[PDB]
């Protein structure tokens, strides 16, 4: 088995599954990007503002800060093979977030909201 319904066929040409994942992946990011999640995903559309946030230690913490806009841009670039390229970077921005931030933080506050929506969204992602 090796994970239930994890894989079954390599993609023909490019997708049938994969770039289909990205149409989803995107609507997903674009959803965290939604005015709905723009209450808290907005600091994720764009990069951790090391100035605005008064970080300084940022570049010590952060090795790969992801931003909903690149990951999206890469969607919009089809640079992402699939939604797991996609969420790899969602997990990246989420990661670098709690990486830097304690869970009593605002960024994490925001982070975990996206964590909820993105992961829920991502649960609706294929793999076939």
């Amino acid at each position: 088995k090796d994970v239930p319904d994890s894989q079954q066929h390599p993609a023909p040409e490019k997708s049938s599954k994969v770039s289909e994942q990205l149409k989803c992946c995107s609507g997903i990011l674009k959803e965290m990007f939604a005015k709905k999640h723009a209450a808290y995903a907005w600091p994720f559309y764009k990069p951790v503002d090391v100035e605005a946030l008064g970080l300084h230690d940022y570049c010590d913490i952060i090795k790969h800060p992801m931003d909903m806009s690149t990951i999206k841009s890469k969607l919009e670039a089809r640079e992402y093979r699939d939604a797991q390229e996609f969420g790899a970077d969602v997990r990246l921005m989420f990661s670098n977030c709690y990486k830097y931030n304690p869970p009593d933080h605002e960024v994490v506050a925001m982070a975990r909201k996206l964590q909820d929506v993105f992961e829920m969204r991502f649960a609706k992602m294929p793999d076939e």
């Binding site: 951790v48 605005a52 008064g54 970080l55 990486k99 830097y100 931030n101 933080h105 506050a109 925001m110």
Partner: peptide
Amino acid sequence: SPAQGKRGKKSA
């Protein structure tokens, strides 16, 4: 001191 804990963002 693992991370500064941003002190970033206030949603607004």
